[PDB]
DNA sequence: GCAGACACTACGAGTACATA
DNA sequence: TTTTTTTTATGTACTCGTAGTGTCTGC
């Protein structure tokens, strides 16, 4: 049947074999549960790598319909994790057995980098005392977050950013499955505005789709409002190669017609930046300056000057990249 | 029968009133189809139109009597904790779908939470909002709302479709004020609305406030350009031209004359900034002289946004463009 | 039944199966075959041995009557003010039959959690009934034990295991569960431990479930090379203002996957300790502080990274 | 009374100056519908006399009924905090800074109640109802989100005026849903105007000499020329030409300070002058206003090559104040600097 | 479209009082047969199962069946102000979000229509296994209430063990120990106040003394509650109302381990 | 000179905490026919008038017509320190800004007196329009006082409707619609129950709760409430007390919504 | 049958601190 | 060889004092 769901939440890896990328942890994890001798866990990385969907496939396979809500006890940041929770619910979930089938229970606490630093040691003892009968499972994306007493009684696997030659398979099936008419050059922005990120991958995906009707280059680009590859080049040409006004009015024209913004046209910038064979102090004024930019467009400031200023660090620098020559 | 202000007497009671925020009115045209609405992050400038967009999407998919039991509108006026995510947020997203619409209309099967100034909300608050939105999804939708999308963290960025609100072109600006001003049976030269469009800077909001208070102003003859340019607070050019003789003349009193002159009349630093931004990168001067000139307008603009003093931003500015005027010579 | 994890199958049940810190062990072992011991604080980095050496000493000094006369409190307890009031003193004034040289022990697990209005309570049942009860503590940030407790009791602090400290149990374990393995791939499990006992163990049972041996490559696909190890050179990269392998070293972090504010972490956790000027330090350290509260107050992209590694560079180049 | 508040006009049609914008206002607010209003300019130009007259153009006589109401309102700390509110039957006059950093629950909590519901009498009073800001500049930006949505969602029968120093600290999504009202500093001539009818009209002779000056040493204050107009008729009723002009004291002590600094640039003299400014921080100076003392009298004894690295400075030092909580740390970082820089430029 | 009318005000509080601070949230099952109501508790260790039959009913209608999971402290606050000796009426519609619950005044004159907004959770049936019991104990909920009470002052588990002679409570705690061993009582006036052992196999196991008082709030349904306990299935406390149902408390044994010595 | 002499402890003991945290201050004037009290609240909502005449005190004597203000933060801390059935007095001086009350301590040995300052503020009577309101009904005073309570529980603002056939009490919240009835309660034995309309005319008005739960705290004063509502004039909570006089509620409607078609 | 006493839990209030 | 005090905005955690209230004792 149809459903009104976002394609972030429609198509989750239900199963194991549904993810894409961590095919190493992927499989350890699966050899853990056949072998039944799952570890408490700890899977940190970026957002939208698949740590939530790993642990509920998991628990999907390790558990049946019947008997799932009484062995997973799943808390997250909208729920309270106080220690006073960590002290009740979660203990005697920990410290009691089954109601219907007998087996090892599982506490699944994400967005556990939430969690406040008492919290956290109490839950030291209620994980080694009672590793016999429950497994605690810990998602973060900052591992700084969590105590290394944690952190130590916990195996850590990291959810590293996915490559974009393994999302192709996956968005090529929800593009099979939505009957979305894409390109080559579409799946490559896709992949490339993604960064590693499978949600953001399937949010543009839908709203290109829901946009224009179509998924190609120009149609991603539009509906995102991200800068083409060419116009940074022509920005960078323009700043690095002529005067302040003639530099201004191409870049104020280019950016009025394409109507772009200056925080993606500092990223890219800053990205081209680095392949440039610029000199070692050029450089580091260069990186300063942008980061003074970048820091500066955080607050209600005036976009133009900012804009203008971004001109200026190169037509300081053009002088100094010549006379070194 | 009271008055009522143009802002609220033409907001958008519809997406096709929207104007120039073409993907986001055909997204949630597609949402009016019945296609799956994601969940959706606005951000752009003031005065683009994220909040007139969203209510007159909600207002077509659940209309007059469903909007009170499928919109939860929280903004920054109202608090907004950790506890309120917890409790307020949390048990509206658990509600059931259910109510029809009596019109014969369709109705979508999920309610929207509207989370408008997103910006005020905290981290910690932020946090509980990631398996809120992924949990409930199936009967309710999120729209986050804000101005600085560095303020919202990067859960709740990719959890959300981005959806930025550029500023309004000239040509869609100048068309929307015509055609309020048509609609109000008042007339305006196409001079005094080439400069409402100019002094408004893609603020629609602006420009609308700026158009009603001319007409009040004017009482119902034509609205010139001299009204346009009293009313908007624009400095006059002789007095950038006299900044500018105080720089080149290289004395620090003569500075001070027209740094007090300027501030004893009332003029905002902000706009003092942007009109010598304006003179300074269309003029003769060396590339070097405008590149510092330019950087220092740029850390006189910050040190504005975080509420210094206007005097001694003005002085510095000015003491800065005076040396590099005055080292020329 | 299910089989436990290594970590916990395979936890030391008598002192002499306590690998590192072998002169304090080898007086818990004296203690325990004797007996009288003092009031202990075992404090140390997590993964030494610390509650194991409580918990074995324990054992071996009482025996048969562990389950009358010892009483184990952890942070997962309540172990208020009205604890160390009502159950600690009552604890403490009980009468338990022992033979001679053998006292109860009130076991205090992670002291750190423990408040200071508890602590100030502890102090008189510590000194009063000494004579019959005996306390032993285990903590990590030896600091949050306030000085009156530390007084009370011999402090034994506990460093980080060695390579082959670590090695020696790993091979008991291995020898104990049949693993295949090679030298490199335990070196590269003794690289990935850091001188933590616990993952140690972690990492070579995920290494042998998943894989089924031990070599490099199959450790180094499931567990990580430590953050701090290419922080230090980026460091030492920004010393020497060269910014082009500093943003290497940056740009292969990033694509790893680590959040600006670990990254800025270890970095702040690098030019701590580092072997520079000391003034060179404090200024590394405001940059850093003035970057994070950047990073911290929503701004964290690898344009601001960037930024503080040129501004790193630039305190170099600015005397 | 005062010459501050004797002699202050009560309608639109009775200001001396700025006679065109009353006309402007008083076509603006003819209608009903005029927009949410940001008046603003410096201190002492008349800005609340031509709110008080917009008041009065919009409602009747009774907008000058003023009484004292105290409100208690709760922080989310459950700390009880009293702040107090000036209204009329017409309108309300709030300054949310007096409560702090917790005005943002005043924006929150006594604003909405006050938004929410409709007026009493409907024919005597009009269909909406009027609040006074004052000194939203010194809001925190928290309160100022959440002044933005009760601006929008009642805003047919609410209606508000903010008034302010410099829109600068005023954020953007407040600045684009309000009329920016500029009201500029009486000129010379105009302040001289206001202080011979204010003489004429208590029957006494004001020559235009002592007039000029008292425009002048006022810094084109209206109300700082009045008090001083009053304060010369105390102390001497003759008016002579060249009669002294009386001073305020923290000004002069300012003054007294930075004459310390400049005598000697040592760090006891640096501790002597931490004491100053300690001594002018208790007074409950603001120290922006200490910072443009300092740059006022600093700069009279620098050099012509100097003055613009110490205007940098103070301005540098300033906005780290604004950003900071303590005041001393960065009053005290200027001085040093500036010691170090006269140093340098006198021994080199 | 859903109506049941309950006969007696005093049964519908009396259920909500024993779950108040146990059960999070009200899943009402509704068929032809009756009511059923099949919720874990917070910490996902207890688990309640309530059956109210139709016949108990004053009217009961049901067209189609549902599932309407609603709110229990939001229920909580509209059963505090209701009559002890009135009609309650338990309404809702086919495709409406909103639970009705119509009754008296305790002045008993004015209708009191109190709507309540239905819930959205996916909750899994949880699957009853319905087996036999190695012990079986008839006993007053009166005793039980005051047993499992008079044991919360000497610990916080108890080791409740049931044989053939009867069933026996343990509690082992900081300032001792408190063994209560109550055995065949059939021999008084009344006829609630018996303890019957039926089954054969001795069990001991040890459970949370905090579940089971709030098991014991249910003391005004049933005058007469039973005990079921095996080694592998958990330890079930069933009150059966008179007339209108029957109402049963699971709950999981703690996981206690032997010493090494 | 102003000296006034009550009957009972308890007339004054209950009736401050219900101006305690409604209104700040209580302005008493004092005439040769009795003592008045007209105050307004901050909020410019709330409005209360408190007449006693002078039949009902055991004595009363005044000579020039003097108005005195004092503060409920005083008042409220020195009422708790006073009895329940004990006597008290009021006795203030022409020229003096003191005013001074004796009564008994708990004790009931010894003379207890407390002074109070005098708060000299400039206030004007709002006048009363005294018109002829569209709806009059009869309620008991001990049953409105769980009116509003039940529907504090709901939300934070309730609807009060007075049509013929009774007054509906209502309020939509988060968590559902509340909604009552109270009508024809003539067939009871004490006289104080009985519900009556007494006009014609209905209406349809919204009120803030909070407000609402402060004029509820005024009812073991009197036995019966009369609430009065209109189109546009505020709604009356009128309390006939004892026997010295009447007790006057008012209460500023809320806004409506733009519902129109 | 109704007034006084006993401990019971829920709730209001004050305070500290949050890093390595 | 030298010691007084309240500001930062939330969120959590701890600790202590207080007040309705269910239940027991008694004439
Ligand atoms: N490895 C993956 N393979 C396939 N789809 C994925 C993968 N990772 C993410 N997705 C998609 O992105 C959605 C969200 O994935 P999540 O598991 O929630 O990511 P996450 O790692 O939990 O990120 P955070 O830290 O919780 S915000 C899923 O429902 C999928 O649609
Ligand atoms: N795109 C638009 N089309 C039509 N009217 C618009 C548009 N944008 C703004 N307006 C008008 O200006 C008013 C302000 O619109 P808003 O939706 O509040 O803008 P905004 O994006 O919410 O600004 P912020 O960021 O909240 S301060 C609306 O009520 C309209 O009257
Ligand atoms: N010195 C050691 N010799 C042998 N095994 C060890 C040693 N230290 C740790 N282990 C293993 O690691 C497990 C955990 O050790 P613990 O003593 O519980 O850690 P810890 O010293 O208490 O550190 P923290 O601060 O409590 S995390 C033990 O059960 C052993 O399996
Ligand atoms: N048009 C005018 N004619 C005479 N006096 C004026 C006029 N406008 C302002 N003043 C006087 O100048 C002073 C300015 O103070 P105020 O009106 O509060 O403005 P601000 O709020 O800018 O200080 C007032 O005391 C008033 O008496
Ligand atoms: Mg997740
Ligand atoms: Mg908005
Ligand atoms: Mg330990």
């Known amino acids: 049947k149809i459903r009104n769901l976002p394609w972030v939440e429609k198509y989750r890896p239900q199963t194991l074999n549904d993810l894409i990328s961590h095919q190493d942890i992927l499989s350890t994890i699966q050899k853990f549960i056949n072998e039944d001798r799952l570890p408490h866990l700890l899977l940190y990385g970026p957002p939208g790598t698949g740590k939530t969907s790993t642990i509920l496939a998991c628990a999907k396979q390790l558990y049946k319909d019947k008997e799932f809500g009484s062995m997973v006890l799943e808390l997250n940041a909208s729920d309270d994790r106080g220690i006073d929770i960590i002290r009740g619910p979660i203990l005697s979930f920990a410290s009691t057995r089954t109601i219907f089938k007998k087996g090892f229970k599982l506490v699944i606490l994400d967005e556990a980098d939430a969690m406040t630093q008492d919290a956290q040691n109490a839950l030291r003892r209620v994980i080694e005392k009672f590793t016999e009968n429950t497994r605690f499972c810990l998602i973060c994306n900052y591992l700084s977050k969590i105590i290394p007493a944690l952190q130590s009684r916990c195996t850590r696997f990291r959810f590293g950013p996915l490559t974009p030659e393994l999302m192709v398979p996956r968005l090529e099936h929800v593009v099979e499955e939505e009957k979305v008419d894409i390109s080559e050059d579409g799946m490559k922005a896709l992949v490339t505005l993604s960064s590693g990120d499978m949600r953001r991958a399937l949010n543009i995906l839908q709203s290109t789709n829901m946009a224009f009707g179509k998924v190609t280059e120009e149609t991603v680009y539009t509906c995102t409002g991200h800068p083409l590859k060419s116009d940074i080049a022509n920005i960078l040409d323009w700043m690095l190669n002529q005067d302040f006004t003639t530099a201004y009015r191409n870049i104020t024209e280019l950016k009025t017609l394409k109507g772009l913004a200056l925080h993606d046209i500092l990223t890219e910038i800053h990205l081209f930046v680095h392949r440039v064979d610029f000199p070692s102090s050029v450089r580091i004024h260069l990186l300063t300056k942008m980061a003074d930019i970048e820091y500066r467009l955080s607050v209600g400031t005036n976009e133009k000057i900012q804009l203008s200023s971004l001109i200026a660090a190169f037509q300081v620098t053009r002088d100094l990249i010549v006379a070194e020559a | ?329 | 039944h299910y089989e436990l994890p290594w970590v916990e199958k395979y936890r030391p049940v008598k002192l002499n199966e306590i690998v590192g810190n072998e002169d304090t062990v080898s007086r818990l072992e004296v203690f325990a075959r004797e007996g009288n011991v003092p009031n202990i604080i075992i404090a140390g980095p997590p993964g030494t041995g610390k509650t194991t050496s409580i918990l074995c000493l324990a054992r071996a000094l009482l025996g048969p009557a562990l389950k009358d006369a010892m009483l184990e409190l952890n942070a997962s307890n309540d172990r208020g003010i009205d604890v160390v009031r009502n159950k600690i003193k009552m604890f403490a004034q009980q009468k338990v039959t022992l033979p001679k040289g053998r006292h109860k022990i009130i076991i205090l697990d992670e002291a750190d959690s423990m408040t200071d209005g508890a602590q100030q309570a502890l102090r008189r049942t510590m000194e009063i009934y000494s004579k019959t009860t005996r306390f032993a503590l285990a903590c990590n940030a030896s600091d949050k034990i306030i000085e009156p407790i530390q007084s009370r009791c011999a402090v034994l602090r506990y460093t980080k295991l060695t390579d082959a400290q670590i090695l020696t149990r790993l091979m008991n374990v291995i020898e104990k569960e049949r693993v295949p393995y090679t030298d490199d791939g335990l070196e590269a499990i003794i690289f990935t431990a850091q001188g933590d006992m616990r993952q140690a163990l972690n990492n070579l049972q995920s290494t042998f479930s998943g894989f089924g041996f031990i070599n490099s490559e199959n450790v180094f696909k499931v567990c990580d090379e430590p953050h701090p190890l290419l922080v230090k050179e980026m460091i030492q990269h920004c010393v020497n203002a060269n910014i082009d392998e500093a943003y290497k070293i940056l740009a292969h972090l990033w694509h790893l996957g680590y959040s600006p504010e670990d990254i800025i972490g270890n970095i702040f956790r690098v030019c701590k300790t580092f072997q520079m000027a000391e003034y060179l330090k404090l200024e590394f350290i405001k940059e850093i502080g003035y970057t994070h509260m950047k990073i911290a107050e929503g701004v964290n992209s690898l344009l601001q990274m960037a930024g503080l590694l040129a501004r790193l560079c630039q305190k170099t180049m600015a005397p | ?348 | 479209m859903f109506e049941a009318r309950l006969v007696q005000g005093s049964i519908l509080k009396k259920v909500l009082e024993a779950l108040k601070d146990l059960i999070n949230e009200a899943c009402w099952d509704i068929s032809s047969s009756g009511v059923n109501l099949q919720s874990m508790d917070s910490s996902h260790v207890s688990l309640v199962q309530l059956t109210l039959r139709s016949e108990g009913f004053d009217t009961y209608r049901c067209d189609r069946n549902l599932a309407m999971g609603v709110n229990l402290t939001s229920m909580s606050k509209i059963l505090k102000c209701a009559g002890n000796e009135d009609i309650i009426t338990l309404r809702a519609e086919d495709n409406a979000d909103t639970l009705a619950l119509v009754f008296e005044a305790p002045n008993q004159e004015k209708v009191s229509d109190y709507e309540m907004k239905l819930m959205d959770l996916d909750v899994e049936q949880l699957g009853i296994p319905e087996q036999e019991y190695s012990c079986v104990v008839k006993m007053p909920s009166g005793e039980f209430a005051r047993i499992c009470r008079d044991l919360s002052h000497i610990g916080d588990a108890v080791v409740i063990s049931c044989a053939k002679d009867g069933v026996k409570f343990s509690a082992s705690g900081e300032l001792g120990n408190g063994n209560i061993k109550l055995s065949q009582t059939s021999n008084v006036d009344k006829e609630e106040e018996a303890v019957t052992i039926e089954m054969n196999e001795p069990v001991q196991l040890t459970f949370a003394l905090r579940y089971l008082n709030f098991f014991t709030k249910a003391t005004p349904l049933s005058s007469t509650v039973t005990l079921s306990m095996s080694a592998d299935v958990p330890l079930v406390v069933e009150y059966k109302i008179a007339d209108m149902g029957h109402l049963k408390y699971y709950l999981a044994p703690k996981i206690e381990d032997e010493e090494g010595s």
């Open chain 2, 1 to 329: 029968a009271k008055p009522v202000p143009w802002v609220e007497k033409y907001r958008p009671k519809c997406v096709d009133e929207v104007a120039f925020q073409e993907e986001v009115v055909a997204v949630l045209k597609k949402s009016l189809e019945g296609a799956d609405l994601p969940n959706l992050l606005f951000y752009g400038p003031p005065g683009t139109g994220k909040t007139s967009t969203i209510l007159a999407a909600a207002r077509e998919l659940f209309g007059p009597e469903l909007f009170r039991l499928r919109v939860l509108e929280l903004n920054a006026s109202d608090e907004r904790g950790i506890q309120v995510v917890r409790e307020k947020v949390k048990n509206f997203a658990q509600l059931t779908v259910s109510g029809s619409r009596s019109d014969g209309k369709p109705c979508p099967p999920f309610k929207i939470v509207i989370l408008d100034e997103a910006d005020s909300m905290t981290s910690a608050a932020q946090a509980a909002l990631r398996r809120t939105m992924e949990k409930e999804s199936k009967t309710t939708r999120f729209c986050l709302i804000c101005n600085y999308v560095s303020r919202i963290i990067e859960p709740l960025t990719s959890r959300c479709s981005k959806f930025r609100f550029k500023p309004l072109s000239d040509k869609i600006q100048q068309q929307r004020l015509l055609d309020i001003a048509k609609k109000e049976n008042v007339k305006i030269s196409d001079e005094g609305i080439a400069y409402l469009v100019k002094v408004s800077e893609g603020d629609l909001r602006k420009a609308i406030t700026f158009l009603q208070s001319a007409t009040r102003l004017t009482g119902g003859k034509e609205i010139t350009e001299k009204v346009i340019t009293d009313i908007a607070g624009v400095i006059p050019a002789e007095k950038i031209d006299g900044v500018f003789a105080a720089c080149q003349s290289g004395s620090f009193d003569k500075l001070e004359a027209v740094v007090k002159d300027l501030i004893d009349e009332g003029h905002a630093a902000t706009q003092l900034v942007n009109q010598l931004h304006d003179v300074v990168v269309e003029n003769n001067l060396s590339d070097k002289q405008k590149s510092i000139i330019t950087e220092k307008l740029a850390e006189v603009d910050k040190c504005l946004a975080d509420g210094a003093d206007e005097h001694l931003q003005l002085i510095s500015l000015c003491a800065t463009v005076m040396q590099q005027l005055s080292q020329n010579c």
């Open chain 4, 1 to 348: 009374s005062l010459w501050v508040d004797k002699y202050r006009p009560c309608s639109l049609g009775r200001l001396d100056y700025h006679k065109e914008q009353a006309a402007q206002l008083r076509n603006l607010v003819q209608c009903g519908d005029f927009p949410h209003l940001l008046v603003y300019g410096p201190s002492g130009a008349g800005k609340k006399t031509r709110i008080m007259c917009i008041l009065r153009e919009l409602y009747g006589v009774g907008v000058e009924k003023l009484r004292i109401e105290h409100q208690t309102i709760t922080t989310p700390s459950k700390k009880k905090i009293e702040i107090s509110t000036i209204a009329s039957n017409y309108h309300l006059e709030v300054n949310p800074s007096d409560a702090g950093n917790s005005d943002r629950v005043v924006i929150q909590e006594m604003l909405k109640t006050v938004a929410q519901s409709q007026q009493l009498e409907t024919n005597s009073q009009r269909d909406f109802k009027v609040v006074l800001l004052t000194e939203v500049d010194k809001l925190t930006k928290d309160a100022q989100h959440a002044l933005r949505r009760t601006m929008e969602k009642y805003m047919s029968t609410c209606r508000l005026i903010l008034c302010c120093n410099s829109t600068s600290k005023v954020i953007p999504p407040i600045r684009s849903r309000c009329l920016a009202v500029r009201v500029p500093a009486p000129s010379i001539e105009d302040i001289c105007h206001v202080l011979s009818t204010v003489c004429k009209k208590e029957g006494l002779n004001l020559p235009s000499q002592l007039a000029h000056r008292l425009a002048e040493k006022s810094c084109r204050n209206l109300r700082k020329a009045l008090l001083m107009c009053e304060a010369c008729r105390v102390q001497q009723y003759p008016f002579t030409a060249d009669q002294e002009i009386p001073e305020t004291d923290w000004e002069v002590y300012l003054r007294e300070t930075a004459n310390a600094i400049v005598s000697q640039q040592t760090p006891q003299r640096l501790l002597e002058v931490r004491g100053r400014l300690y001594e002018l921080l208790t007074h409950c100076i603001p120290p922006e206003i200490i910072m443009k003392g300092l740059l006022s009298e600093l700069l009279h004894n620098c050099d012509g090559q100097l003055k613009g690295e110490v205007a940098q400075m103070a301005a540098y030092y300033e906005h780290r104040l604004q950003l900071g909580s303590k005041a001393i740390y960065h009053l005290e970082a200027f001085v040093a600097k500036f010691m170090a820089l006269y140093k340098k430029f006198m021994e080199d």
